[PDB]
Amino acid sequence: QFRAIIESPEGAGHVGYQYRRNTGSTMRMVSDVLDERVSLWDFHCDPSGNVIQPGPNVDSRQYLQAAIDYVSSNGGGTITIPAGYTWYLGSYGVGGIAGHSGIIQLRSNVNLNIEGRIHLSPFFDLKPFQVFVGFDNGDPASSGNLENCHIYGHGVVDFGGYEFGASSQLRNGVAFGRSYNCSVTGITFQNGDVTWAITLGWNGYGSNCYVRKCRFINLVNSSVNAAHSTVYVNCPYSGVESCYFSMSSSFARNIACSVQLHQHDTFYRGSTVNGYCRGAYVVMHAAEAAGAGSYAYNMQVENNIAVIYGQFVILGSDVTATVSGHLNDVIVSGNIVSIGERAAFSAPFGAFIDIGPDNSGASNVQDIQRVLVTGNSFYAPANITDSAAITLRANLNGCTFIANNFDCRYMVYNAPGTTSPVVQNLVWDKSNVIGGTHANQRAGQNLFDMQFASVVNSTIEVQLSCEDLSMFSCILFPASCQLSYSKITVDSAWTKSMSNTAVFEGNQQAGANVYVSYPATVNLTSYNTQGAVPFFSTDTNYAWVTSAYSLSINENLDFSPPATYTNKANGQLVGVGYNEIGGVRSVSVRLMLQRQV
Amino acid sequence: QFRAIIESPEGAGHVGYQYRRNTGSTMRMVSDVLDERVSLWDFHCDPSGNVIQPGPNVDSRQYLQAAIDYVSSNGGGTITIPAGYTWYLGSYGVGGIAGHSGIIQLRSNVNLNIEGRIHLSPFFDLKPFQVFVGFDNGDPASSGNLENCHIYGHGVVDFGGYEFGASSQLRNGVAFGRSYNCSVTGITFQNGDVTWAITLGWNGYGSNCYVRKCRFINLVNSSVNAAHSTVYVNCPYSGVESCYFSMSSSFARNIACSVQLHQHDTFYRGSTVNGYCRGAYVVMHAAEAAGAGSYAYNMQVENNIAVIYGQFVILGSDVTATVSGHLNDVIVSGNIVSIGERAAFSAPFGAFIDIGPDNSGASNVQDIQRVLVTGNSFYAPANITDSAAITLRANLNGCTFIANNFDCRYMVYNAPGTTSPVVQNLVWDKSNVIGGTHANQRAGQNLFDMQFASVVNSTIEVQLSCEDLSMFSCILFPASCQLSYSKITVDSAWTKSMSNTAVFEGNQQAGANVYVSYPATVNLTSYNTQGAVPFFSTDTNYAWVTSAYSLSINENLDFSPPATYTNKANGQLVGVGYNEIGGVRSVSVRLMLQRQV
Amino acid sequence: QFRAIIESPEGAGHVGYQYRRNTGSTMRMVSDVLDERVSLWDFHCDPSGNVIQPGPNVDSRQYLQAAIDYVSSNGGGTITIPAGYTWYLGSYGVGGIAGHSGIIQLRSNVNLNIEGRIHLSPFFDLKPFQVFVGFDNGDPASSGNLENCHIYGHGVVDFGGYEFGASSQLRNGVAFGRSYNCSVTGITFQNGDVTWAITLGWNGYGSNCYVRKCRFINLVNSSVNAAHSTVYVNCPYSGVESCYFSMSSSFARNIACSVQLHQHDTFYRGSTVNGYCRGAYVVMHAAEAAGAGSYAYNMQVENNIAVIYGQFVILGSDVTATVSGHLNDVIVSGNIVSIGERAAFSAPFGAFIDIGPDNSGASNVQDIQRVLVTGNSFYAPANITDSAAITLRANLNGCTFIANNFDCRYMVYNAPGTTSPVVQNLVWDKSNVIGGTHANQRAGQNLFDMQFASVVNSTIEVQLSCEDLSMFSCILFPASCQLSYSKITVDSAWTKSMSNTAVFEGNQQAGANVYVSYPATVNLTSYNTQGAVPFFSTDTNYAWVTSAYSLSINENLDFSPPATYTNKANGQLVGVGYNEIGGVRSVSVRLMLQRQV
Ligand SMILES: CC(=O)N[C@@H]1[C@@H](O[C@H]2O[C@H](CO)[C@H](O[C@H]3O[C@H](CO[C@@H]4O[C@@H](C)[C@H](O)[C@@H](O)[C@H]4O)[C@@H](O)[C@H](O)[C@H]3O)[C@H](O[C@@H]3O[C@H](CO)[C@@H](O)[C@H](O)[C@H]3NC(C)=O)[C@H]2O)[C@H](O)[C@@H](CO[C@H]2O[C@H](CO)[C@@H](O)[C@H](O)[C@H]2O)O[C@@H]1O
Ligand SMILES: CC(=O)N[C@@H]1[C@@H](O[C@H]2O[C@H](CO)[C@H](O[C@H]3O[C@H](CO[C@@H]4O[C@@H](C)[C@H](O)[C@@H](O)[C@H]4O)[C@@H](O)[C@H](O)[C@H]3O)[C@H](O[C@@H]3O[C@H](CO)[C@@H](O)[C@H](O)[C@H]3NC(C)=O)[C@H]2O)[C@H](O)[C@@H](CO[C@H]2O[C@H](CO)[C@@H](O)[C@H](O)[C@H]2O)O[C@@H]1O
Ligand SMILES: CC(=O)N[C@@H]1[C@@H](O[C@H]2O[C@H](CO)[C@H](O[C@H]3O[C@H](CO[C@@H]4O[C@@H](C)[C@H](O)[C@@H](O)[C@H]4O)[C@@H](O)[C@H](O)[C@H]3O)[C@H](O[C@@H]3O[C@H](CO)[C@@H](O)[C@H](O)[C@H]3NC(C)=O)[C@H]2O)[C@H](O)[C@@H](CO[C@H]2O[C@H](CO)[C@@H](O)[C@H](O)[C@H]2O)O[C@@H]1O
Ligand code: NA
Ligand code: NA
Ligand code: NA
Ligand code: NA
Ligand code: NA
Ligand code: NA
């Protein structure tokens, strides 16, 4: 009788236990203490209750789903995926997750402690899939929420190396769904061709979702893969920290981004990226504005390390028929970024910041402002013509650069005869240090190439830290660019031998509220009078100049040109020098030309 | 016989076990392996040893205390609070913690792994309480220490929604006490009206205490609550990182602060705050100086995201009869902060930095210096008159601003006819970017309103980035403010149409070691002489000016005014221009006035 | 029969269990569920299988090694070191780790969850040791890898207080070896005299190794200890975050460093250091370049708090017969550092950044560039003569300072008649704020002491924020230092009473591509002519000056000196002033001297 009970599945419920033989402890049964934990092994059995060993020819999916469903029924808990085993998944899930090509359905309060390895079987080759899905409905708009679901451990999700079957397919590791207080910590995602590794939230619905101390390795492998973003953050008060992202595929240099920050109060910090095209998008899509409003604000990209091939941070916002997206209150700081070794134009245009047109190419829908870029480093190798501190390709309502170090081909750039952005409140502080890696490479090129429709309320304070006489100019405005209510200065250091410093092809520096200064060489002639004597410019190009001063020594004994000049209505400069002995003087002098500064 | 033993509480101590049938493993009994872990279930029993189910009508407090006391007796360990259950607490603790309105007494080396939910029963409604207390005595001065106590897990402490009964009451979640190597990680504290969620240390006694990845949600709910600070850090080598703080109550906008950093080598990093009045205090209270000395130094507030209604960082120090507190070596960097949408003056004055008078209102007791504020963003909506980069309300011995972006009503402010602080070593670097949100709102107002007793060894380098002709002046010193050994500059950009740029109501810019420059409009008249000819100012207000130069074009052909001016003893400016044709000239010119720069 | 089986070591394999009595769960045996975890207790037994109690007189080493070896055999897992016990280690390991004075050999996929205490027995007194070793061979070049090995928990590794027996000995806590995806989290290392606490990687071989939330306390205690670096990072894509490091020994002030970052893509963040000589080395040793190439790049030191006695960050690179090491793409940001209270010259020279010669003292082997130092604070007490923002002691190919706050004796320093470094691309932006703690201490001293062989492509923009008339000069170049293609400026603020501002002992400011400006006092005499009249310098020292302007008021009525000057071939300055009444004038005026700026 008793032997039978003991050898039965209830035997453990008949063996008494009391913790450490403490007389004041609960008199329990072994089964009670065992019931305090739960593993996959508890559900990984055949219809007769016999345990089944996982392996390449066993599909563990129904067993893991049964575990999650059961623990869900009790109010939650943590299911362990045991170490020292690989658990293969080999069929699709059913019900609500079928619309998402779901394998496993996550449930609220049911955490997974993944210590072993989860692998995809070749059933998934050339097919879409999303491994873990928190939606409970095919239609995300009619889905319930996922709350308090955490995935963590020292384990591994391995996507089996399979290529995409078709570019239109989607593949994901974890889709938390309409996700509140959910996280992934510690896990290695590897060996795939996927669209995302993790997505958080759904069109603004969700909160407090995080990815921390995870690794993402080799998650693009084919030319079929349309696009890849390793973590898409689509709910507020969420972010990514202390993660490692690496790709080795060539295709990843053209298509892969590490992070999308698409809702307010989101962050990307303390991570290391290598082998990717892009670092992060910081974006408000109107099409995603349902759950948390139409503004992306409080967006933070900080203290990351990257080697990328395209753009580090891309800013944007866009509209739909009924919603307009807005982006503001952004900080990009402390990141050290480089474009990896590559040929010029062999990948998307290299940039630290990109102001990106929308997915249909429009550049007149964006509302981006109050962005602070500060205390970052950027480097691109000397050969990479297509490298810029900022590629400013769509309308910009403000962006502030302070105390960065940029060492690349262009500081500000936009391609001519593409978009003509409207620019407001572009602020480039004199504390931005311009590196010299690209010195001597800039023939035909303008360091600050202002290829815009208009610039207003902007500040460009150019300071070189070494010579580059190859460059056509430090800063150039084409005649088509309006310029008003702006400050544009070129410091003289390392400019003495430059023919052109600042160029205003439409003579826009004449505007009533344009404040500029830059070096120029000017020819002057004096009157013949002995004593105090006026010197006048030969050219009549200076009706806009409020004052000028000498940047050249005077090699003469018998006279000196004026130290300082003002102008005359006919556009000459004029100053008062000194003839110790009389005679008409003729000199060529390097001047600092100033207007309202 | 054997059946009896097996069904007894010692039955598990009679069932042999050897790990994985390994012949070299220990021959143990099931009870030994079970004894490797411990849960609340092991103590949650009646006097007969029968397990009791937790619930709203069961008080789990004595059972949890018995578990902690027992594990403490064995040298420590980790007690799990099981998932899928809510454990209610419904009575006060006894002994040493009674003086602290304690519920549970923490003990050294006994960690709590909280995976379920701990809730307060309505016994606590309208009463004080501190849920977990690490002091062992009613009098903190006679308390022993708490060491090596960690609280962690995916669980929840829920304060039951109860309001305070009286403003003088105190309520806390975790009071570690005189706490060494203690931490809270992962836990959600929610649904209360409390004074603090967590306190670390006691008046400088403690070390290596941290709060990490915790959430604090809705912990103020009534007008009775006197004050709320979510984490009070009162021991050195301690801090808060990667936490989330949110309030929805109106009252929280007026009374709630996220963090107090009150001892040296403490930090607040990588967190997100919404709905609070204040971000952090960085303070040395003399009354708290017993355990770690009288200096708060090495204080770090970094990489946080906040939407607040009052002040982001408040600095201070104060004194007692016998102790003087000092604050120095502070860094505030990388934070992106905004004042949330509100009416002007509807909450405490909005500020990025506040120099706060002591709790009795004194402004002449503080010793604050060597503070660095760098690479932060601040924004306040255009309507919020009461918004400042720094509200400088008490004596300041130094604070350095570099490469911040401030977009609010005032840069520097103090209210006139309140405190008259004594200011030393206020440094505002030209790399601080002043935003334009408040342009056109500043009628009657000074952007830098220097409402102080005295300013010395200070630097204010004003740089606008857009026009605001509504403002009375960029910077103004009342006659009551002494000014010496200081540098005060206003860059000309966007100032051409300003009637007043810098204003010294006591003509303080004349001081021997004052170094200033700013734009002014000046009327000048020349002598009638043809040729080189002097121009003189009509007004005699310029005896302090060392040089001036033209910021205006010359619309004339027949003459030019001087490019550069110096002065004369009677206070006129004078320069040498050029009359091509003779005649008395009269012109109004915008000049850069300079003094010793 | 059945009684015998049940009391046997297989008894638990005969007691059936099914999780929570769920009919769809696996019918298992108690032994199966127990086998899901493993502890030291499972191996801590005598030859008869009887458990042995750990203690000061028991050597736990063979038992722990047996556990690791066994778990390794099953594909890995996590062995717990139980809480509430101290486990002593009292003999050396055997085999592959014997060459490393190894105690325990780590194995791939076998994690240690250390919750108790591991202590060293006095067998190790005066001997070398490395507690945990991941190499499997005496010769690291012939060692296999360690992968997926994590050490974590709330436990403690205690080195027993024993002193080193001889300086040439080595002692370590954890040597992961050729280590891929390995980490230490949560652990306290204490009470030793050791060389390192943790090393990661081996000469570039390894990846994704981290130390997080660990504490290192009192790990130097004797004068025998040659050198100490708490964490040596010798593999890429690895780092240290949120750690606490403290020393109390005097010897630690002279010999101890917290971190070595010696391979690319490595970081040191969010940590607190006290009592150490140095913060971090960022170094490419040619001798260590085998596994990850010859370049250290993407090196990040950020958001740390330190009180040190020598240098905070030391940069270097060096060569071997066949390999040349290079260092580039470094960021040092957000750190708040101070030199602790000490006598001048009582420890290694105090510095925020050191450019360190190699271990044989060579200063002409280094290739260091593209370094960004930004948004840091540094303080040293007024008495510490040996304190510098940068001690630039070996060849430097570039380093950029922006928006730091440095408050110490020197800004730039190198000792004369030591090394004569070759300097390129030293950039000190005007946004670096120079503190006043050392005002009045600088007799005989130059704030920027340019004791170099040559300086090129460099920028020094000096800005004072208070007076220090004790200093000999703001910046001084000895005649032996060449200077070309550089910008050197001293802002006038707080300089009016300085006899020397910038000093060029070799008249190097005359160079064709040197761009300089600084204040000087000049004596001038005019001609006697009434009206517009020239003033000329008495001295002929100004042939290099392109323009000068007045920094002094004019106390005269009857005349004014020129506002602005240029020069003449004989080296005089000349300008045009105004005599209202005739007469030879003689004045002494403070001028801003400018050259090509
Ligand atoms: C790979 C990636 O992330 N790319 C970024 C762009 O994302 C956009 O394209 C993606 C391509 O894969 C996604 O669209 C695709 O997936 C959609 C969502 O799938 C459906 O809904 C899921 C919830 C279900 O599980 C699925 O079964 C499926 O039903 C699908 O509707 C599209 O048809 C398909 O092409 C991506 O869509 C978002 O995905 C997230 C995460 O899964 C999800 O939370 C969202 O709900 C979903 N959004 C929308 C609108 O559906 C889609 O956004 C991204 O647009 C771009 C940003 O840069 C551009 O835009 C900037 C702003 O104008 C501009 O500054 C910049 O210059 C532009 O380049 O960045 C990546 O390219
Ligand atoms: C809510 C909050 O934190 N407010 C900050 C101010 O704190 C000060 O007021 C608090 C109001 O709750 C606390 O005082 C209250 O509690 C005291 C401590 O309780 C006793 O001791 C405990 C150890 C026991 O468990 C309790 O049972 C009880 O016996 C009590 O003595 C007071 O009477 C009561 O009002 C707070 O007190 C500190 O609390 C911490 C954490 O519990 C504890 O470690 C300390 O020991 C205790 N300190 C003292 C001195 O007792 C008390 O400090 C805080 O002052 C303010 C800082 O800003 C102001 O001061 C700046 C410096 O001059 C100035 O720059 C600024 O402008 C000022 O506004 O910030 C919050 O307001
Ligand atoms: C304490 C410390 O870390 N000091 C830093 C300097 O490190 C150099 O000296 C150390 C002194 O302990 C180490 O050398 C010692 O150990 C060597 C390694 O031990 C062998 O190999 C191990 C793998 C085995 O387990 C051991 O059993 C043993 O066989 C040994 O070869 C030496 O003979 C001995 O003195 C340190 O050596 C490195 O150690 C790490 C971690 O263990 C290991 O991964 C490496 O493989 C090993 N490297 C080498 C080359 O062997 C050795 O590097 C460090 O040099 C210094 C940097 O600053 C100087 O150099 C800069 C660049 O030129 C210059 O800018 C600066 O001014 C200089 O001061 O910083 C610390 O001093
Ligand atoms: Na779908
Ligand atoms: Na901005
Ligand atoms: Na246009
Ligand atoms: Na009390
Ligand atoms: Na400071
Ligand atoms: Na006064």
Ligand code: NA
């Ligand atoms: Na060795």
Ligand code: NA
């Ligand atoms: Na640099």
Ligand code: NA
């Ligand atoms: Na030389």
